[PDB]
Amino acid sequence: RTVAGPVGGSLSVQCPYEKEHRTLNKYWCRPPQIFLCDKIVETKGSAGKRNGRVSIRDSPANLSFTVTLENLTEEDAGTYWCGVDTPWLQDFHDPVVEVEVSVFPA
Amino acid sequence: RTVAGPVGGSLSVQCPYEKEHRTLNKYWCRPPQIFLCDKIVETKGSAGKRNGRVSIRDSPANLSFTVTLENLTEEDAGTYWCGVDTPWLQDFHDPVVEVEVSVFPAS
Amino acid sequence: SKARTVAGPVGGSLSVQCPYEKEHRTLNKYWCRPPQIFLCDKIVETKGSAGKRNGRVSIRDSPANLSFTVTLENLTEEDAGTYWCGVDTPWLQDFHDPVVEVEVSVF
């Protein structure tokens, strides 16, 4: 998926998932070179739900979660994964929506 | 996931998988390293279902398979992979569930 | 594991429900205060030497519904506290993460 916002602006991405995933850890990360991606925020694991300009909120009742990036900078752009964390060692084998972030001039 | 048992005792470990994997070879292997992980037991592969004190049994109805260790020894402890042998290209290799096996004193 | 609080009145028959997943279906299901060291003292269990019924405690597995139930009769203040809705391999004493960590509160 592709999403775009202006520098200084904000963006949110909604990522859907299936009913059995309601209670699983939900996360946001860049695609890794190792099995585990470096989770920027997550709903249940140790990254925390908020880290600086990035936050994550799960809405099981709608079968989706939303990642929000505040005060965008050019560095925020790029490929990300929004994932639901399943038993697999590698996050690649989770249900993942790939999200491509663009950041344009304000 | 960690499963543990006493020296001389037994344990079994469950390894979940996806519906797509029901018909695939399942395995149990040590070291957790791609290519170097040697399959101790497999459900279809030539390692066989039982290799000494270890066996494997698949239950596609519960989307998991179970590895059993008997007569545990200290050397049985370590990190293992429960693996699904997927016959297609994967950028991060076969899907695996990582299991820490621990052995505690025999009571 | 998952966390559940189960509350009921003193002298009541308290019904603790412990859901689980498909991988746990065939496992022994148990009730116990969490382990002092490695393993807990199984109060009741569905597939073990402990028995499904002992004193005011009894257990019933409902694998079709991916849940088991522990019933506490004649609930007292001393019953409050932390417990494991535990799982292990039938007829043996191995360590698995419990499926539910239960807090019993008595009012």
PDB file of C-alpha atoms in Angstrom:
ATOM      1  CA  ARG A   1       0.000   0.000   0.000  1.00  0.00           C
ATOM      2  CA  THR A   2       1.136   3.518  -0.540  1.00  0.00           C
ATOM      3  CA  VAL A   3       0.446   6.519   1.777  1.00  0.00           C
ATOM      4  CA  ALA A   4       1.673  10.134   1.641  1.00  0.00           C
ATOM      5  CA  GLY A   5       1.642  13.206   3.896  1.00  0.00           C
ATOM      6  CA  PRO A   6       3.358  16.588   4.087  1.00  0.00           C
ATOM      7  CA  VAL A   7       6.353  17.529   6.248  1.00  0.00           C
ATOM      8  CA  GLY A   8       5.039  18.819   9.521  1.00  0.00           C
ATOM      9  CA  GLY A   9       1.742  17.092   8.897  1.00  0.00           C
ATOM     10  CA  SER A  10       0.518  13.785  10.165  1.00  0.00           C
ATOM     11  CA  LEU A  11      -0.458  10.471   8.612  1.00  0.00           C
ATOM     12  CA  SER A  12      -2.334   7.447   9.792  1.00  0.00           C
ATOM     13  CA  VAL A  13      -2.486   3.960   8.250  1.00  0.00           C
ATOM     14  CA  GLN A  14      -5.226   1.477   9.105  1.00  0.00           C
ATOM     15  CA  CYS A  15      -4.202  -2.173   8.864  1.00  0.00           C
ATOM     16  CA  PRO A  16      -6.985  -4.867   8.842  1.00  0.00           C
ATOM     17  CA  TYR A  17      -6.700  -8.400  10.202  1.00  0.00           C
ATOM     18  CA  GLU A  18      -8.764 -11.566  10.661  1.00  0.00           C
ATOM     19  CA  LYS A  19     -10.892 -12.462  13.753  1.00  0.00           C
ATOM     20  CA  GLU A  20      -8.443 -14.996  15.282  1.00  0.00           C
ATOM     21  CA  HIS A  21      -5.841 -12.193  15.352  1.00  0.00           C
ATOM     22  CA  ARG A  22      -7.898  -9.907  17.651  1.00  0.00           C
ATOM     23  CA  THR A  23      -5.713 -10.483  20.749  1.00  0.00           C
ATOM     24  CA  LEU A  24      -2.319 -10.816  19.123  1.00  0.00           C
ATOM     25  CA  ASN A  25       0.478  -8.283  19.327  1.00  0.00           C
ATOM     26  CA  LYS A  26       0.177  -5.697  16.491  1.00  0.00           C
ATOM     27  CA  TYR A  27       3.315  -3.856  15.357  1.00  0.00           C
ATOM     28  CA  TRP A  28       4.967  -1.384  12.946  1.00  0.00           C
ATOM     29  CA  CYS A  29       8.494  -1.783  11.689  1.00  0.00           C
ATOM     30  CA  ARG A  30      10.797  -1.350   8.796  1.00  0.00           C
ATOM     31  CA  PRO A  31      11.524  -4.596   6.842  1.00  0.00           C
ATOM     32  CA  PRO A  32      14.475  -6.369   8.523  1.00  0.00           C
ATOM     33  CA  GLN A  33      17.730  -8.028   7.447  1.00  0.00           C
ATOM     34  CA  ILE A  34      17.302 -10.375  10.382  1.00  0.00           C
ATOM     35  CA  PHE A  35      14.427 -12.631  11.478  1.00  0.00           C
ATOM     36  CA  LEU A  36      12.975 -10.138  13.959  1.00  0.00           C
ATOM     37  CA  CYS A  37      12.045  -6.674  12.747  1.00  0.00           C
ATOM     38  CA  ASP A  38      12.860  -3.786  15.016  1.00  0.00           C
ATOM     39  CA  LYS A  39       9.462  -2.917  16.292  1.00  0.00           C
ATOM     40  CA  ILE A  40       9.012   0.833  16.385  1.00  0.00           C
ATOM     41  CA  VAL A  41       5.731   0.539  18.262  1.00  0.00           C
ATOM     42  CA  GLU A  42       3.541  -2.465  19.158  1.00  0.00           C
ATOM     43  CA  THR A  43       0.292  -2.971  21.036  1.00  0.00           C
ATOM     44  CA  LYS A  44       1.523  -5.719  23.499  1.00  0.00           C
ATOM     45  CA  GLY A  45       5.282  -6.223  23.274  1.00  0.00           C
ATOM     46  CA  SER A  46       8.071  -4.223  24.888  1.00  0.00           C
ATOM     47  CA  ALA A  47       8.449  -1.460  22.268  1.00  0.00           C
ATOM     48  CA  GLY A  48       5.461   0.298  23.827  1.00  0.00           C
ATOM     49  CA  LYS A  49       2.443   1.723  22.003  1.00  0.00           C
ATOM     50  CA  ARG A  50       3.967   5.165  21.680  1.00  0.00           C
ATOM     51  CA  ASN A  51       7.496   6.159  20.933  1.00  0.00           C
ATOM     52  CA  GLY A  52       7.926   9.793  20.122  1.00  0.00           C
ATOM     53  CA  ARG A  53       6.002  10.789  17.015  1.00  0.00           C
ATOM     54  CA  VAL A  54       4.710   7.218  16.351  1.00  0.00           C
ATOM     55  CA  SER A  55       1.825   5.453  18.036  1.00  0.00           C
ATOM     56  CA  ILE A  56      -0.369   2.408  17.509  1.00  0.00           C
ATOM     57  CA  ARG A  57      -3.960   1.677  18.563  1.00  0.00           C
ATOM     58  CA  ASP A  58      -5.754  -1.627  18.111  1.00  0.00           C
ATOM     59  CA  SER A  59      -9.473  -1.750  17.423  1.00  0.00           C
ATOM     60  CA  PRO A  60     -10.402  -5.439  17.677  1.00  0.00           C
ATOM     61  CA  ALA A  61     -14.105  -4.601  17.303  1.00  0.00           C
ATOM     62  CA  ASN A  62     -13.383  -3.435  13.733  1.00  0.00           C
ATOM     63  CA  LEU A  63     -10.677  -6.005  13.059  1.00  0.00           C
ATOM     64  CA  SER A  64      -8.011  -3.346  12.358  1.00  0.00           C
ATOM     65  CA  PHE A  65      -5.332  -1.341  14.007  1.00  0.00           C
ATOM     66  CA  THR A  66      -4.052   2.110  13.181  1.00  0.00           C
ATOM     67  CA  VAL A  67      -0.528   3.475  13.193  1.00  0.00           C
ATOM     68  CA  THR A  68      -0.208   7.266  13.423  1.00  0.00           C
ATOM     69  CA  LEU A  69       2.886   9.306  12.623  1.00  0.00           C
ATOM     70  CA  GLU A  70       2.826  12.863  13.866  1.00  0.00           C
ATOM     71  CA  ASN A  71       4.957  15.835  12.690  1.00  0.00           C
ATOM     72  CA  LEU A  72       6.341  14.025   9.615  1.00  0.00           C
ATOM     73  CA  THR A  73       9.915  14.473   8.480  1.00  0.00           C
ATOM     74  CA  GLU A  74      11.548  13.341   5.255  1.00  0.00           C
ATOM     75  CA  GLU A  75      13.302  10.546   7.149  1.00  0.00           C
ATOM     76  CA  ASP A  76       9.930   8.865   7.933  1.00  0.00           C
ATOM     77  CA  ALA A  77       9.439   7.933   4.308  1.00  0.00           C
ATOM     78  CA  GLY A  78      10.029   4.399   3.128  1.00  0.00           C
ATOM     79  CA  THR A  79       8.855   0.823   3.375  1.00  0.00           C
ATOM     80  CA  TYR A  80       7.201  -0.427   6.539  1.00  0.00           C
ATOM     81  CA  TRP A  81       5.399  -3.498   7.742  1.00  0.00           C
ATOM     82  CA  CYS A  82       2.285  -3.432   9.759  1.00  0.00           C
ATOM     83  CA  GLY A  83       2.141  -6.876  11.226  1.00  0.00           C
ATOM     84  CA  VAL A  84       0.311  -9.143  13.553  1.00  0.00           C
ATOM     85  CA  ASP A  85       2.771 -11.236  15.550  1.00  0.00           C
ATOM     86  CA  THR A  86       2.113 -14.998  15.186  1.00  0.00           C
ATOM     87  CA  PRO A  87       4.208 -17.848  16.688  1.00  0.00           C
ATOM     88  CA  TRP A  88       6.776 -17.883  13.799  1.00  0.00           C
ATOM     89  CA  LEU A  89      10.298 -16.828  14.647  1.00  0.00           C
ATOM     90  CA  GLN A  90      10.490 -14.713  11.535  1.00  0.00           C
ATOM     91  CA  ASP A  91       8.150 -11.641  11.319  1.00  0.00           C
ATOM     92  CA  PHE A  92       8.196 -12.150   7.526  1.00  0.00           C
ATOM     93  CA  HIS A  93       5.817 -15.151   8.032  1.00  0.00           C
ATOM     94  CA  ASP A  94       3.312 -13.086  10.009  1.00  0.00           C
ATOM     95  CA  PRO A  95       0.298 -11.553   8.330  1.00  0.00           C
ATOM     96  CA  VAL A  96       1.891  -8.336   7.155  1.00  0.00           C
ATOM     97  CA  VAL A  97       0.600  -5.449   5.047  1.00  0.00           C
ATOM     98  CA  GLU A  98       3.532  -3.716   3.359  1.00  0.00           C
ATOM     99  CA  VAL A  99       3.120   0.058   3.488  1.00  0.00           C
ATOM    100  CA  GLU A 100       5.140   2.467   1.453  1.00  0.00           C
ATOM    101  CA  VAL A 101       5.346   5.967   3.047  1.00  0.00           C
ATOM    102  CA  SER A 102       5.985   9.130   1.003  1.00  0.00           C
ATOM    103  CA  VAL A 103       6.626  12.484   2.570  1.00  0.00           C
ATOM    104  CA  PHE A 104       6.161  15.643   0.437  1.00  0.00           C
ATOM    105  CA  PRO A 105       6.933  19.345   1.055  1.00  0.00           C
ATOM    106  CA  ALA A 106       4.508  21.143   3.386  1.00  0.00           C
TER     107      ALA A 106
ATOM    108  CA  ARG B   1       8.324 -20.885  23.978  1.00  0.00           C
ATOM    109  CA  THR B   2      10.082 -22.907  26.682  1.00  0.00           C
ATOM    110  CA  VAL B   3       9.246 -26.486  27.595  1.00  0.00           C
ATOM    111  CA  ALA B   4      11.100 -28.252  30.407  1.00  0.00           C
ATOM    112  CA  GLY B   5      11.319 -31.619  32.142  1.00  0.00           C
ATOM    113  CA  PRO B   6      13.316 -33.346  34.776  1.00  0.00           C
ATOM    114  CA  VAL B   7      16.540 -35.364  34.079  1.00  0.00           C
ATOM    115  CA  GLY B   8      15.218 -38.886  33.253  1.00  0.00           C
ATOM    116  CA  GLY B   9      11.670 -37.631  32.692  1.00  0.00           C
ATOM    117  CA  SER B  10       9.883 -36.823  29.418  1.00  0.00           C
ATOM    118  CA  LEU B  11       8.386 -33.747  27.752  1.00  0.00           C
ATOM    119  CA  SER B  12       6.531 -32.913  24.621  1.00  0.00           C
ATOM    120  CA  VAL B  13       6.350 -29.710  22.681  1.00  0.00           C
ATOM    121  CA  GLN B  14       3.619 -28.414  20.394  1.00  0.00           C
ATOM    122  CA  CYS B  15       4.447 -26.530  17.248  1.00  0.00           C
ATOM    123  CA  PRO B  16       1.647 -24.640  15.547  1.00  0.00           C
ATOM    124  CA  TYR B  17       1.371 -23.901  11.881  1.00  0.00           C
ATOM    125  CA  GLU B  18      -0.902 -22.553   9.136  1.00  0.00           C
ATOM    126  CA  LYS B  19      -3.585 -24.397   7.143  1.00  0.00           C
ATOM    127  CA  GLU B  20      -1.345 -24.230   3.985  1.00  0.00           C
ATOM    128  CA  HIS B  21       1.219 -26.338   5.859  1.00  0.00           C
ATOM    129  CA  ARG B  22      -1.043 -29.288   6.692  1.00  0.00           C
ATOM    130  CA  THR B  23       0.424 -31.593   4.043  1.00  0.00           C
ATOM    131  CA  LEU B  24       4.044 -30.476   4.334  1.00  0.00           C
ATOM    132  CA  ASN B  25       6.969 -32.257   5.990  1.00  0.00           C
ATOM    133  CA  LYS B  26       7.380 -31.088   9.592  1.00  0.00           C
ATOM    134  CA  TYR B  27      10.647 -31.291  11.432  1.00  0.00           C
ATOM    135  CA  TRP B  28      12.552 -30.818  14.665  1.00  0.00           C
ATOM    136  CA  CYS B  29      16.157 -29.568  14.417  1.00  0.00           C
ATOM    137  CA  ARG B  30      19.148 -28.109  16.356  1.00  0.00           C
ATOM    138  CA  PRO B  31      21.170 -25.498  15.989  1.00  0.00           C
ATOM    139  CA  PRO B  32      18.794 -22.737  15.112  1.00  0.00           C
ATOM    140  CA  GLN B  33      20.780 -21.807  12.024  1.00  0.00           C
ATOM    141  CA  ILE B  34      19.590 -21.981   8.425  1.00  0.00           C
ATOM    142  CA  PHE B  35      21.229 -24.960   6.655  1.00  0.00           C
ATOM    143  CA  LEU B  36      23.094 -26.024   9.796  1.00  0.00           C
ATOM    144  CA  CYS B  37      19.970 -27.034  11.663  1.00  0.00           C
ATOM    145  CA  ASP B  38      20.063 -30.852  11.508  1.00  0.00           C
ATOM    146  CA  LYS B  39      16.743 -32.573  11.392  1.00  0.00           C
ATOM    147  CA  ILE B  40      16.546 -35.017  14.220  1.00  0.00           C
ATOM    148  CA  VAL B  41      13.080 -36.242  13.236  1.00  0.00           C
ATOM    149  CA  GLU B  42      10.674 -35.457  10.399  1.00  0.00           C
ATOM    150  CA  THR B  43       7.113 -36.470   9.629  1.00  0.00           C
ATOM    151  CA  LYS B  44       7.769 -37.266   5.937  1.00  0.00           C
ATOM    152  CA  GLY B  45      11.538 -36.773   5.387  1.00  0.00           C
ATOM    153  CA  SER B  46      14.211 -39.422   5.462  1.00  0.00           C
ATOM    154  CA  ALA B  47      15.230 -38.667   9.047  1.00  0.00           C
ATOM    155  CA  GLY B  48      12.210 -40.821  10.054  1.00  0.00           C
ATOM    156  CA  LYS B  49       9.476 -40.189  12.689  1.00  0.00           C
ATOM    157  CA  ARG B  50      11.499 -41.608  15.542  1.00  0.00           C
ATOM    158  CA  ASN B  51      15.220 -41.353  16.191  1.00  0.00           C
ATOM    159  CA  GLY B  52      16.208 -42.834  19.567  1.00  0.00           C
ATOM    160  CA  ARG B  53      14.588 -40.867  22.416  1.00  0.00           C
ATOM    161  CA  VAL B  54      12.897 -38.390  20.018  1.00  0.00           C
ATOM    162  CA  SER B  55       9.691 -38.713  17.980  1.00  0.00           C
ATOM    163  CA  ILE B  56       7.359 -36.453  15.953  1.00  0.00           C
ATOM    164  CA  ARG B  57       3.590 -36.797  15.270  1.00  0.00           C
ATOM    165  CA  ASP B  58       1.559 -34.395  13.100  1.00  0.00           C
ATOM    166  CA  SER B  59      -2.042 -33.381  13.760  1.00  0.00           C
ATOM    167  CA  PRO B  60      -3.296 -31.335  10.806  1.00  0.00           C
ATOM    168  CA  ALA B  61      -6.760 -31.144  12.461  1.00  0.00           C
ATOM    169  CA  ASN B  62      -5.229 -29.033  15.290  1.00  0.00           C
ATOM    170  CA  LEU B  63      -2.814 -27.314  12.902  1.00  0.00           C
ATOM    171  CA  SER B  64       0.143 -28.420  14.998  1.00  0.00           C
ATOM    172  CA  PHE B  65       2.609 -31.231  15.455  1.00  0.00           C
ATOM    173  CA  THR B  66       4.231 -32.541  18.597  1.00  0.00           C
ATOM    174  CA  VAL B  67       7.778 -33.492  19.332  1.00  0.00           C
ATOM    175  CA  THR B  68       8.320 -35.903  22.276  1.00  0.00           C
ATOM    176  CA  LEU B  69      11.590 -36.322  24.170  1.00  0.00           C
ATOM    177  CA  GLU B  70      11.999 -39.360  26.460  1.00  0.00           C
ATOM    178  CA  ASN B  71      14.505 -40.038  29.217  1.00  0.00           C
ATOM    179  CA  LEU B  72      15.776 -36.454  29.199  1.00  0.00           C
ATOM    180  CA  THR B  73      19.437 -35.776  29.664  1.00  0.00           C
ATOM    181  CA  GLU B  74      21.245 -32.511  30.359  1.00  0.00           C
ATOM    182  CA  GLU B  75      22.508 -32.450  26.768  1.00  0.00           C
ATOM    183  CA  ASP B  76      18.879 -32.425  25.524  1.00  0.00           C
ATOM    184  CA  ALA B  77      18.553 -28.788  26.577  1.00  0.00           C
ATOM    185  CA  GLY B  78      19.043 -25.956  24.124  1.00  0.00           C
ATOM    186  CA  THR B  79      17.287 -24.018  21.418  1.00  0.00           C
ATOM    187  CA  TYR B  80      15.578 -25.977  18.646  1.00  0.00           C
ATOM    188  CA  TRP B  81      13.452 -25.162  15.586  1.00  0.00           C
ATOM    189  CA  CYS B  82      10.155 -26.683  14.840  1.00  0.00           C
ATOM    190  CA  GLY B  83      10.131 -26.322  11.062  1.00  0.00           C
ATOM    191  CA  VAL B  84       7.752 -26.565   8.147  1.00  0.00           C
ATOM    192  CA  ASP B  85       9.522 -27.721   5.016  1.00  0.00           C
ATOM    193  CA  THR B  86       7.992 -25.384   2.420  1.00  0.00           C
ATOM    194  CA  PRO B  87       8.820 -26.329  -1.224  1.00  0.00           C
ATOM    195  CA  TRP B  88       9.041 -22.761  -2.498  1.00  0.00           C
ATOM    196  CA  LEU B  89      11.427 -19.809  -2.325  1.00  0.00           C
ATOM    197  CA  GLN B  90      11.381 -17.795   0.909  1.00  0.00           C
ATOM    198  CA  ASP B  91      13.389 -14.740   1.650  1.00  0.00           C
ATOM    199  CA  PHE B  92      13.628 -15.689   5.337  1.00  0.00           C
ATOM    200  CA  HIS B  93      13.688 -19.469   4.831  1.00  0.00           C
ATOM    201  CA  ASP B  94      11.286 -22.135   6.075  1.00  0.00           C
ATOM    202  CA  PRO B  95       8.737 -20.958   8.646  1.00  0.00           C
ATOM    203  CA  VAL B  96      10.002 -22.073  12.058  1.00  0.00           C
ATOM    204  CA  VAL B  97       8.795 -21.835  15.630  1.00  0.00           C
ATOM    205  CA  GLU B  98      11.714 -21.511  18.060  1.00  0.00           C
ATOM    206  CA  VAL B  99      11.610 -23.669  21.234  1.00  0.00           C
ATOM    207  CA  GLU B 100      13.844 -23.438  24.263  1.00  0.00           C
ATOM    208  CA  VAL B 101      14.185 -26.874  25.876  1.00  0.00           C
ATOM    209  CA  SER B 102      15.354 -26.897  29.499  1.00  0.00           C
ATOM    210  CA  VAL B 103      16.207 -29.791  31.787  1.00  0.00           C
ATOM    211  CA  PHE B 104      16.032 -29.480  35.557  1.00  0.00           C
ATOM    212  CA  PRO B 105      17.205 -31.838  38.344  1.00  0.00           C
ATOM    213  CA  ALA B 106      15.396 -35.182  38.679  1.00  0.00           C
ATOM    214  CA  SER B 107      13.409 -34.765  41.982  1.00  0.00           C
TER     215      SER B 107
ATOM    216  CA  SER C   1      -0.445 -16.798  28.944  1.00  0.00           C
ATOM    217  CA  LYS C   2      -3.663 -14.841  29.230  1.00  0.00           C
ATOM    218  CA  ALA C   3      -4.847 -13.116  32.439  1.00  0.00           C
ATOM    219  CA  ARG C   4      -8.354 -13.724  33.914  1.00  0.00           C
ATOM    220  CA  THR C   5      -9.898 -12.526  37.227  1.00  0.00           C
ATOM    221  CA  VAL C   6     -12.748 -14.753  38.375  1.00  0.00           C
ATOM    222  CA  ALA C   7     -14.869 -13.327  41.193  1.00  0.00           C
ATOM    223  CA  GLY C   8     -17.674 -14.947  43.234  1.00  0.00           C
ATOM    224  CA  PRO C   9     -19.276 -14.849  46.701  1.00  0.00           C
ATOM    225  CA  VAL C  10     -17.936 -16.689  49.734  1.00  0.00           C
ATOM    226  CA  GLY C  11     -19.574 -20.094  50.045  1.00  0.00           C
ATOM    227  CA  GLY C  12     -20.461 -20.058  46.379  1.00  0.00           C
ATOM    228  CA  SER C  13     -19.506 -22.675  43.771  1.00  0.00           C
ATOM    229  CA  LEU C  14     -17.148 -20.654  41.625  1.00  0.00           C
ATOM    230  CA  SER C  15     -16.851 -21.609  37.960  1.00  0.00           C
ATOM    231  CA  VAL C  16     -13.440 -20.736  36.453  1.00  0.00           C
ATOM    232  CA  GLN C  17     -13.299 -20.953  32.632  1.00  0.00           C
ATOM    233  CA  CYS C  18      -9.940 -21.377  31.008  1.00  0.00           C
ATOM    234  CA  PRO C  19      -9.877 -20.974  27.285  1.00  0.00           C
ATOM    235  CA  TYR C  20      -7.054 -22.255  25.150  1.00  0.00           C
ATOM    236  CA  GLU C  21      -6.008 -22.751  21.548  1.00  0.00           C
ATOM    237  CA  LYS C  22      -6.050 -25.757  19.170  1.00  0.00           C
ATOM    238  CA  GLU C  23      -2.414 -26.702  19.941  1.00  0.00           C
ATOM    239  CA  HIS C  24      -3.463 -27.299  23.573  1.00  0.00           C
ATOM    240  CA  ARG C  25      -6.444 -29.495  22.680  1.00  0.00           C
ATOM    241  CA  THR C  26      -5.014 -32.881  23.600  1.00  0.00           C
ATOM    242  CA  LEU C  27      -2.913 -31.736  26.534  1.00  0.00           C
ATOM    243  CA  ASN C  28      -3.509 -32.563  30.163  1.00  0.00           C
ATOM    244  CA  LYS C  29      -5.380 -29.612  31.710  1.00  0.00           C
ATOM    245  CA  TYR C  30      -4.615 -28.702  35.320  1.00  0.00           C
ATOM    246  CA  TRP C  31      -5.317 -26.345  38.303  1.00  0.00           C
ATOM    247  CA  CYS C  32      -2.629 -25.268  40.730  1.00  0.00           C
ATOM    248  CA  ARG C  33      -1.002 -22.421  42.628  1.00  0.00           C
ATOM    249  CA  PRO C  34       1.968 -21.288  40.535  1.00  0.00           C
ATOM    250  CA  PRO C  35       5.176 -23.403  40.858  1.00  0.00           C
ATOM    251  CA  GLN C  36       7.395 -22.824  43.907  1.00  0.00           C
ATOM    252  CA  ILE C  37      10.448 -23.708  41.775  1.00  0.00           C
ATOM    253  CA  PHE C  38      10.021 -25.706  38.542  1.00  0.00           C
ATOM    254  CA  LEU C  39       6.689 -27.506  38.654  1.00  0.00           C
ATOM    255  CA  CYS C  40       3.454 -26.758  40.498  1.00  0.00           C
ATOM    256  CA  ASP C  41       1.532 -29.043  42.792  1.00  0.00           C
ATOM    257  CA  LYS C  42      -1.377 -30.056  40.568  1.00  0.00           C
ATOM    258  CA  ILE C  43      -4.581 -29.713  42.636  1.00  0.00           C
ATOM    259  CA  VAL C  44      -6.667 -31.416  39.917  1.00  0.00           C
ATOM    260  CA  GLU C  45      -5.930 -32.473  36.344  1.00  0.00           C
ATOM    261  CA  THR C  46      -7.703 -34.143  33.463  1.00  0.00           C
ATOM    262  CA  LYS C  47      -4.916 -36.603  32.499  1.00  0.00           C
ATOM    263  CA  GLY C  48      -2.570 -37.193  35.371  1.00  0.00           C
ATOM    264  CA  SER C  49      -2.104 -39.011  38.639  1.00  0.00           C
ATOM    265  CA  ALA C  50      -3.713 -36.087  40.512  1.00  0.00           C
ATOM    266  CA  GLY C  51      -7.352 -36.918  39.682  1.00  0.00           C
ATOM    267  CA  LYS C  52     -10.119 -34.701  38.217  1.00  0.00           C
ATOM    268  CA  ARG C  53     -11.775 -34.190  41.616  1.00  0.00           C
ATOM    269  CA  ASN C  54     -10.222 -33.472  44.988  1.00  0.00           C
ATOM    270  CA  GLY C  55     -12.056 -31.881  47.916  1.00  0.00           C
ATOM    271  CA  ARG C  56     -13.851 -28.722  46.833  1.00  0.00           C
ATOM    272  CA  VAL C  57     -11.949 -28.606  43.502  1.00  0.00           C
ATOM    273  CA  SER C  58     -12.945 -30.384  40.269  1.00  0.00           C
ATOM    274  CA  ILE C  59     -11.975 -29.967  36.598  1.00  0.00           C
ATOM    275  CA  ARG C  60     -13.635 -30.772  33.257  1.00  0.00           C
ATOM    276  CA  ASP C  61     -12.136 -30.326  29.771  1.00  0.00           C
ATOM    277  CA  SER C  62     -14.289 -29.205  26.837  1.00  0.00           C
ATOM    278  CA  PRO C  63     -11.912 -29.623  23.827  1.00  0.00           C
ATOM    279  CA  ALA C  64     -14.683 -29.116  21.284  1.00  0.00           C
ATOM    280  CA  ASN C  65     -15.068 -25.681  22.801  1.00  0.00           C
ATOM    281  CA  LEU C  66     -11.322 -25.003  23.383  1.00  0.00           C
ATOM    282  CA  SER C  67     -11.869 -24.370  27.055  1.00  0.00           C
ATOM    283  CA  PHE C  68     -11.717 -26.133  30.348  1.00  0.00           C
ATOM    284  CA  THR C  69     -13.592 -25.454  33.603  1.00  0.00           C
ATOM    285  CA  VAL C  70     -12.390 -25.628  37.210  1.00  0.00           C
ATOM    286  CA  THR C  71     -15.118 -25.530  39.835  1.00  0.00           C
ATOM    287  CA  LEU C  72     -14.396 -24.333  43.385  1.00  0.00           C
ATOM    288  CA  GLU C  73     -17.048 -25.446  45.880  1.00  0.00           C
ATOM    289  CA  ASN C  74     -17.684 -23.700  49.186  1.00  0.00           C
ATOM    290  CA  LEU C  75     -15.440 -20.789  48.228  1.00  0.00           C
ATOM    291  CA  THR C  76     -13.549 -19.292  51.198  1.00  0.00           C
ATOM    292  CA  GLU C  77     -11.240 -16.258  51.640  1.00  0.00           C
ATOM    293  CA  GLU C  78      -8.231 -18.640  51.655  1.00  0.00           C
ATOM    294  CA  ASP C  79      -9.128 -19.645  48.049  1.00  0.00           C
ATOM    295  CA  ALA C  80      -8.345 -16.100  46.783  1.00  0.00           C
ATOM    296  CA  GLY C  81      -5.128 -15.553  44.961  1.00  0.00           C
ATOM    297  CA  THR C  82      -3.171 -16.536  41.914  1.00  0.00           C
ATOM    298  CA  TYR C  83      -3.552 -19.823  40.083  1.00  0.00           C
ATOM    299  CA  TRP C  84      -2.559 -21.385  36.795  1.00  0.00           C
ATOM    300  CA  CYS C  85      -4.930 -22.839  34.305  1.00  0.00           C
ATOM    301  CA  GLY C  86      -2.032 -25.116  33.339  1.00  0.00           C
ATOM    302  CA  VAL C  87      -1.311 -27.534  30.541  1.00  0.00           C
ATOM    303  CA  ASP C  88       1.170 -30.383  30.239  1.00  0.00           C
ATOM    304  CA  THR C  89       1.630 -33.650  28.308  1.00  0.00           C
ATOM    305  CA  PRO C  90      -0.731 -36.393  29.432  1.00  0.00           C
ATOM    306  CA  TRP C  91       0.674 -38.683  32.188  1.00  0.00           C
ATOM    307  CA  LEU C  92       3.810 -36.782  32.579  1.00  0.00           C
ATOM    308  CA  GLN C  93       5.184 -33.858  34.477  1.00  0.00           C
ATOM    309  CA  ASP C  94       6.681 -31.412  32.023  1.00  0.00           C
ATOM    310  CA  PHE C  95       6.652 -27.651  32.121  1.00  0.00           C
ATOM    311  CA  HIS C  96       4.519 -25.630  29.659  1.00  0.00           C
ATOM    312  CA  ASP C  97       3.493 -21.962  29.970  1.00  0.00           C
ATOM    313  CA  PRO C  98      -0.009 -21.966  31.534  1.00  0.00           C
ATOM    314  CA  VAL C  99      -2.820 -21.064  29.209  1.00  0.00           C
ATOM    315  CA  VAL C 100      -4.417 -18.696  31.719  1.00  0.00           C
ATOM    316  CA  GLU C 101      -3.088 -17.047  34.903  1.00  0.00           C
ATOM    317  CA  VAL C 102      -6.149 -16.760  37.063  1.00  0.00           C
ATOM    318  CA  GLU C 103      -6.737 -14.390  39.904  1.00  0.00           C
ATOM    319  CA  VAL C 104      -9.499 -15.659  42.166  1.00  0.00           C
ATOM    320  CA  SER C 105     -11.211 -12.978  44.228  1.00  0.00           C
ATOM    321  CA  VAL C 106     -13.692 -13.812  46.908  1.00  0.00           C
ATOM    322  CA  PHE C 107     -16.482 -11.460  48.082  1.00  0.00           C
TER     323      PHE C 107
END
